[PDB]
Structures are given as C-alpha cells and as structure tokens.
Amino acid sequence: FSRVQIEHISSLIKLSKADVERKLSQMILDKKFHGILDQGEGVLIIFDEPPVDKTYEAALETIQNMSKVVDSLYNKAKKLT
Amino acid sequence: RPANHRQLTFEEIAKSAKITVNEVELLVMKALSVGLVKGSIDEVDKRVHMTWVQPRVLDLQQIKGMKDRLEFWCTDVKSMEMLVEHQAHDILT
Amino acid sequence: AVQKVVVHPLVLLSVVDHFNRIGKVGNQKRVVGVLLGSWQKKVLDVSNSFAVPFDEDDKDDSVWFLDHDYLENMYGMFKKVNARERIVGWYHTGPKLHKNDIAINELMKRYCPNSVLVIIDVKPKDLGLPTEAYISVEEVHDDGTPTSKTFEHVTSEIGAEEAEEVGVEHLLRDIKDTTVGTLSQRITNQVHGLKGLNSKLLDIRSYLEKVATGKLPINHQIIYQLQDVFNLLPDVSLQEFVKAFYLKTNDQMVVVYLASLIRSVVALHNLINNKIANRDAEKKEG
Amino acid sequence: DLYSRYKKLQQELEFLEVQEEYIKDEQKNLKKEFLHAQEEVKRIQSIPLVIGQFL
Amino acid sequence: TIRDEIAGCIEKAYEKILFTEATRILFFNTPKKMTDYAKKRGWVLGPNNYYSFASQQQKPEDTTIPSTELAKQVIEYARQLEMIV
Incomplete structure (x- = not known):
C-alpha cells in the first residue's frame, strides 16, 4: 500500500516511529524504496515514474555530437587556412 | 443522459430506488451480476461509476437525430481528410 | 460453423x-x-x-x-x-x-x-x-x-498462396508498390474513411426508407436493439476522456522527440560528409 | 528585331522549365521504382539458403 | 499612460492579497479609481481581501487542441520529406 499512516505501519513492523521515519527515509536515500513520507499528518506515500530511457538516448547522441562538429571543425576550417 | 459523464452518485440511486444507502451496494452489484452493466462503485463519496450499458428499445425521431450524429461524422471526416490530402496532392503526381 | x-x-x-x-x-x-x-x-x-x-x-x-x-x-x-x-x-x-x-x-x-x-x-x-x-x-x-x-x-x-501470387503481382503494372509509409496509409485514410461515410449514409438512408416505405416493417426485429447499440456510446467527456487527451499528448512526446533525434543524426552525417567531399572535389580540381 | 528575339527567348526558357518539373517528377517516380528494385534485391532470394565452405 | 498600464501590468496573473494593501495599490484614501479597476480587473472583489480564482487562471491543459496542429506539422513536413525525397 502506497499511502499509509506512519503509526500503524510502525505497528506492523513493531518499532518506534522515530527510527521508522529515519530508517524509511534512509531507504529513500538508498533509492531502492520509491516514495516519501509526510511528518505533518504522519503519512507515507509511494510513487514512481521509472523510465528515463529516452533522455539517455538523447543525451548520448547530442553530447557526443558536440565532438562531432568539433571533428568537422578540423576539415571545414582547414580549407580556409 | 447524453453524458458520459458515466459517474453517478449515491444520492441519485438512493433517491430514485428509495432504498437505504446500505442496500444500494447489493442493488448495483446485482445488476453487475445480471450483465446489464460492468461498472464499478466509488465508495468514498459513495459514487457509482457506470461502464457501457444494456441497450433496450429506443424510439421514433431517433432515426433522424441518428442521421444528424452520422452526417456530422460524415462532414467531419470528409472535410478533415480532404484537407489532409489537399496538402500532399501536389507532391504525389 | x-x-x-x-x-x-x-x-x-x-x-x-x-x-x-x-x-x-x-x-x-x-x-x-x-x-x-x-x-x-x-x-x-x-x-x-x-x-x-x-x-x-x-x-x-x-x-x-x-x-x-x-x-x-x-x-x-x-x-x-x-x-x-x-x-x-x-x-x-x-x-x-x-x-x-x-x-x-x-x-x-x-x-x-x-x-x-x-x-x-x-x-x-x-x-x-x-x-x-x-x-x-x-x-x-x-x-x-x-x-x-x-x-x-x-x-x-x-x-x-504462391503461383496465384505470381500471376497477378506481375499483372498489376499499374500503381507504385507499396509504397510503405508515405502514400499507403494516407490513401487508406481517404478510402476507409470516405467509403465509411457513404456506407453508413446510404445504410442509414435505407434505415429511414425502410420505415417510410416497405413496412412491414422493418421495425423492429433488430431495429430497436441495433439502434440502441448506436446510442451505446455518444461518447464525449467529461471526464476520463479529458485525461486521455493530454495522455495521448504525452504519447506523441516520445515519438516526436525521437523524430528530432533522427533529424540531428541525418543532418549531421549527410551535411558534414557531403560538404567534405564537395569542398575537397572543388579545391582539388580547381 | 530586338523585341522580336526578346519574345523568342522565353520559348525555350519555359520549355526547359516544364522539362524541370518533368524530370523532377520523372526521377521521383523512377526513384520509387528503384526503391521497389531495392525491395526485390533484399527479397532475393532465400530463405532457405545453403551455406557453403569458402576458400 | 502610467495609471492604465499599472492595471495592465498587474494581473493576470498575481496571487491572493489583502484589502488595505490594495488601498496601498492605488493610494489616495478610498478613491473611485479602486472601483473602476476592481470592476475592470475581474480578477475578484472579495471582502477585506482579493483572489486570483479560478484558477491561476483558466487552467490551460492543453489536451488535444495542440494535437491537431501536431498532425498538421508533419502533414506539410512529410510534404517537405517528399520534396527531397
């Protein structure tokens, strides 16, 4: 269950809320646990939007395509001088 | 209703069927077992979300409005599609 | 059966x-x-x-x-x-x-x-x-x-199957084949769309004509149920159909993003290599 | 004479202009025929193809 | 041209603010210009406050309204693709 209260999820894990909030947030620090907690109302919500794949393809192309035009700087600026 | 706008509320069913709010569950879900609707019930606001429908009868002056809903689809596709290939008719040859 | x-x-x-x-x-x-x-x-x-x-x-x-x-x-x-x-x-x-x-x-x-x-x-x-x-x-x-x-x-x-394909595929000698991706899908958008317009048009013309003339009857062995099946889905928003809109917008994101990627790759390769072999052929011959 | 030949110089100009659009549409259709020929040579041949011992 | 362009450069879009500072907006004490603008703005006239509702405003989606021109974009662009070809 994504959205859950912190006190009764600490009742399922049988632990105090202080080190439940800090360990769960430590799991968010590890990125293995997708989600975040809420201290104000004592809520914990899980949400994810995994795929970056298209940005990886884009960046891989264009970032190297910089050096591509740098490689064309050699030939096309050689005919000038 | 023209709808959909297929999401209803508990006040609509409970007022029409004049039955208690606890029995509207059995009410709408039995209709799900009958097969006339596949919809789902949102029980937070106690809303009822219908899906599809069971066709039963209909009526006169409905074949006319049916031609209106059709001919509108006719001039829609005709116009837009004749605009599509109006652009690319040149380059084809 | x-x-x-x-x-x-x-x-x-x-x-x-x-x-x-x-x-x-x-x-x-x-x-x-x-x-x-x-x-x-x-x-x-x-x-x-x-x-x-x-x-x-x-x-x-x-x-x-x-x-x-x-x-x-x-x-x-x-x-x-x-x-x-x-x-x-x-x-x-x-x-x-x-x-x-x-x-x-x-x-x-x-x-x-x-x-x-x-x-x-x-x-x-x-x-x-x-x-x-x-x-x-x-x-x-x-x-x-x-x-x-x-x-x-x-x-x-x-x-x-095989030989029946051989005969007719040589016998066409008429229109381009296919061609895949350009004229094919859009001409099908004309034919299937427009022939779908006049289909139901003339078919709905028979729907009203049969009620006007020809009774009995034809209404309604299936008229009442078939016409209500036409009234099954109008079908417009609100609500979730509005969500499908910008979700479909979010669907065209990726493909058009990839389109701009092919634009950069095609322009990079072709333009650089062509100008190279161009300026080289001119400066060496001239 | 000057205006005469001046009115005589746009004949072959417009003739070469209609030859432009002609040969453009020509090599456009023949290009698609060459793409069709590419579909032939890529279809050719088999599927199934016997592999053999090369020297 | 200063007075009318302040009413043109304020909203849309600005967030919620209180009354006596809208008295500080147009100054004076309680001028009739504050009634002329609170009408013209629209925007909102709240008691002892003002709002940007609703909401922020008009909530551009834009849903599939851009999808039609998105179709048209490659309609004439594939026409340019056929111009190469």
Missing part, C-alpha cells in the same frame, strides 16, 4: 469469364456455378471452381435447375486430377439475391454437410472488396416462428 472464407482471384475470375461466356449471348438473370472449396480448418479457403449453365424463369420466379451430370462427372474430373479439391457450395453474380436462392442450397446439402453460397460481382463499382459470402444455417428466430433460413453473412477476404 463457417467463420470467414478466403476467396482467391482465380475463383472470382472463373465466374466473371463465364459472365463473358453467357454474356456475349446474354441476357438477363445471373451467372451460377458450383463452388469448389478447400477446408483445412474453421477458416475456409477457395482454390478452383466450375460453372454450369443455369436459367431461371420469372413467372414462377421460384423455378431453378442445374445439371447434376455436369456436377457429378466434372467433380469426378476435378477430384481425379486434384484429390484436395471438393465442392463446398455454389455461387452466383447477384448483385442482390432473390428469395429463390435458398432452395438451390437445400438441394445440394446432400453433396456437402454445409453449403456456403458466394454472391459475386462481375463489374467492380462499389463499395469495396467485391462479392459476398452467405452460409446456409437455420437460426429460427426470437419470435419462435417455424424454422426458416435467413443466410448469415460470412466475411470474405482475398488471398493467394
């Missing part, structure tokens, strides 16, 4: 060339012959056929006869040369079947357990894939009338 049939161009031409046979002598009525089918599975396939001389009086519009000796020994001829071929039914050129066509199938039900009759069209006009397919079945009725036979429509598709 029979779901769909595969009509090769060979059987269609085998009816149409016989429409030249009796068409040069004329006059009225239609070209009727015996259909040779091939049943490998629930999907039906057609390979060869043969046509028999047929005449039908109008007097007496219900009178029809065929030559059984022609059906017998020629089936003995075609089964001999090809053991895979057998008669699955008969066919006629229509264009619209008169009520007498039922008893023809009822006579040849002794030859085949289920005889599917194929209406065909010798002159292509409208609206689409030619011919037609009707299977012989007893549906009775929801009104509990004494059992009568109204032939159910079988969807017909055109196909081939």
